[PDB]
Amino acid sequence: SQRPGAHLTVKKIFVGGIKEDTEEHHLRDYFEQYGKIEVIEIMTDRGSGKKRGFAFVTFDDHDSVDKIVIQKYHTVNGHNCEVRKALSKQEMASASSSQRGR
């Protein structure tokens, strides 16, 4: 558990572990309590065009995300899913490769 760019301000959160059929309205309905949401990115598969397994929630502000990204498992729709800072697939490669320990 590194917290992807914890010192960095983020404006989109990653929703994983969604075993229940969760969509845009579900996520927004929960995360709106934290702050102003921009869009809910239900990231479909770029091959078949299906619910690939994960989604993102874009916020208009990077403070609204802070109350969220600090906690991992959030209960949305009634299911307790995993929420973390949504780092780009570009960044997630570099950040994972440069995973440092002391």
Add this chain to the structure above:
RNA sequence: UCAGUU
């Protein structure tokens, strides 16, 4: 379905 075609 736990990452935006890593």
